[PDB]
Structure formats: structure tokens, C-alpha cells
């Protein structure tokens, strides 16, 4: 075997062609940008989560 998979049909493991080691693949961290505000009629300062 060369590279792995799962039920998700995504590549999460691979063999290094340089040395005999097993490496796992974890995607870059991401997410949505949520902005919390008390309303523009009250203030201007906001909080980002």
C-alpha cells in the first residue's frame, strides 16, 4: 500500500518516498468569521469570534 483513505474518500495518510515512515494528513485550520455587535444604533465596538 502507498497512501490511505477512509469512509470519507479523502487522503489522510501517505508513505514517504524518502524514508520508511507513516505520516498523517490533517487539513489547514479554517472556519467561519462571526461578528458580534450590539447594533449600530448603540455603539461601534464589535467582537469577532
Amino acid at each position: 500500500q502507498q497512501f490511505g483513505r477512509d469512509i470519507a474518500d479523502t487522503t489522510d495518510a501517505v508513505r514517504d518516498p524518502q524514508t520508511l515512515e507513516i505520516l498523517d494528513i490533517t487539513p489547514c485550520s479554517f472556519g467561519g468569521v462571526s461578528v458580534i455587535t450590539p447594533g449600530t444604533n448603540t455603539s461601534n465596538q464589535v467582537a469577532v469570534l
Binding site: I7, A8, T26, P27, S29, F30
Partner: protein, 39 residues
């Protein structure tokens, strides 16, 4: 059914039985993302 302070969670014996009985066999997607985290 009343909660007891001898356990960290504010549950009872029947409540913990419900949580430990409904689970997933790692055949889906919630366990990979929802329950921990690895995206």
C-alpha cells in the same frame, strides 16, 4: 432519576444510561467532527 453530587455531571443513573447507549459505529460524519478537536 434525581441527580446526585457524587458524580461530576449533574445527571442520574437513567440519564447516563441514555447517553452511553445511543452512539455511532464510526460509519458517519458527526464523530469525526462533532464529538472530540480534528477538523
Amino acid at each position: 432519576i434525581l441527580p446526585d453530587p457524587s458524580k461530576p455531571s449533574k445527571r442520574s443513573f437513567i440519564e447516563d444510561l441514555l447517553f452511553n447507549k445511543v452512539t455511532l459505529a464510526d460509519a458517519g460524519f458527526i464523530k469525526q467532527y462533532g464529538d472530540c478537536c480534528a477538523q
